[PDB]
Design a protein around this ligand. Sequence first.
Ligand SMILES: [Mg+2]
Length: 139
Amino acid sequence: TETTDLSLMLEQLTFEFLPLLEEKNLNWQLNLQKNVLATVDTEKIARVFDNLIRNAINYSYPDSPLLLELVESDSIHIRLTNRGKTIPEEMIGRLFEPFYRMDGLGLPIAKEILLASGGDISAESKDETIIFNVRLPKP
Ligand SMILES: [Mg+2]
């Protein structure tokens, strides 16, 4: 039953990804609150975030920011926003359905992981913006 410092994790992950932002001239815009702890396996959640960031890099328009926000309120909230082609509402509703991408990677599995961790994930898209919202329980 590990405790993960999500603030440290995302500070490190965003730094490590810097070389991968160069090809499309992306930049981080970070709003990461500090000392945000969650009861979740560290490597498991880091692998979920790695996949969400890689999807955001691949989705993104060039010359654009990737906005990553970490807030502690009644739950812990992580939001990753990129600019890109708007995802239509029909598609948004199916992003977490297994094998829909065969009808971004890893989205059904992200939801399975987060639900079993006592949290969840959702997606929104409007006005050339694509947003993934992750919730985790506060200890
Ligand atoms: Mg391992």
